[PDB]
Amino acid sequence: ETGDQRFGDLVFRQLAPNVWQHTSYLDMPGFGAVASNGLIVRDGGRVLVVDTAWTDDQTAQILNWIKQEINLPVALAVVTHAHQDKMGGMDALHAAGIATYANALSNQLAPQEGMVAAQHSLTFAANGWVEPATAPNFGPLKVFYPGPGHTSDNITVGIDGTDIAFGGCLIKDSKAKSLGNLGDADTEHYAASARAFGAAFPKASMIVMSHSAPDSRAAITHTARMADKLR
Ligand SMILES: O=C(O)c1cccc(/C=N/n2c(S)nnc2-c2ccc(C(F)(F)F)cc2)c1
Ligand SMILES: [Ca+2]
Numbered sequence: 001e002t003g004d005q006r007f008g009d010l011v012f013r014q015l016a017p018n019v020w021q022h023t024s025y026l027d028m029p030g031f032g033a034v035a036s037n038g039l040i041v042r043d044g045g046r047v048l049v050v051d052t053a054w055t056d057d058q059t060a061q062i063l064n065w066i067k068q069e070i071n072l073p074v075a076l077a078v079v080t081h082a083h084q085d086k087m088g089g090m091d092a093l094h095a096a097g098i099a100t101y102a103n104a105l106s107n108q109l110a111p112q113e114g115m116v117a118a119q120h121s122l123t124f125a126a127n128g129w130v131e132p133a134t135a136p137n138f139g140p141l142k143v144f145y146p147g148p149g150h151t152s153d154n155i156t157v158g159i160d161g162t163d164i165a166f167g168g169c170l171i172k173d174s175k176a177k178s179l180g181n182l183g184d185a186d187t188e189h190y191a192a193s194a195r196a197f198g199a200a201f202p203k204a205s206m207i208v209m210s211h212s213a214p215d216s217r218a219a220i221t222h223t224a225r226m227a228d229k230l231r
């Protein structure tokens with residue numbers, strides 16, 4: 001924490017001239033305070049958001065920080081899988097008038113997970129890249145579905161014009177001890193999905209992820225190696 005800004009419970013860190021990481025925390029029984037990170041991207045006269053915070057109230061804090069500090073309208077948000085860390089604050093996005101997008105499968109799973117679905121569904125080609133007609137006006141956000149991993153619906157995003165790719169919850173940092181897979185993880189394909197993400201954004205040198213500070217491409221290698229052992 002040096003250069004980090006705080007708004008309420010949220011912490012913000014600039015990653016590049018037009019990119020910030022948002023971080024919110026949830027106190028959990030064993031882990032203590034657990035961070036969830038997402039991204040804010042300034043793209044011309046508009047802002048794009050990747051992932052909510054854990055809660056609606058935390059997510060409203062992101063939006064108020066954007067309003068106060070960047071002062072540009074948030075055009076859209078994309079959420080990266082249907083669990084509370086990434087979709088917990090959908091109601092706040094909706095109340096703010098923001099158009100929301102998620103993988104079709106995330107929207108299908110959302111009711112079962114107790115999450116609110118996004119307003120729009122992204123679909124993907126067989127090579128993993130988003131169908132452009134389902135992601136209109138996404139500017140520099142390049143959305144890629146790497147295959148099943150943490151969940152069957154997890155997606156990732158690269159930011160054109162930067163060194164940054166965001167693996168969301170599929171990628172763990174190079175010091176992580178395990179993947180924390182539950183019954184919805186696909187342990188057969190996890191390693192291939194982590195490598196696919198690596199291959200989709202081969203020029204990214206800063207890997208942003210949900211539960212650790214940004215890492216090098218070591219995070220991708222490490223995640224894939226740990227996943228190799230789940231087979
Ligand atoms: O890697 C780590 O350090 C770390 C530590 C602790 C958790 C995680 C992952 N969190 N997570 C992912 S991913 N998908 N869903 C969740 C989630 C959903 C609800 C709850 C809660 F609290 F509400 F029940 C908690 C977690 C990752
Ligand atoms: Ca809610």
Ligand SMILES: [Zn+2]
Pocket residue numbers: 081082083150151169
């Ligand atoms: Zn999850």
Ligand SMILES: [Zn+2]
Pocket residue numbers: 085168169210211
């Ligand atoms: Zn997560």
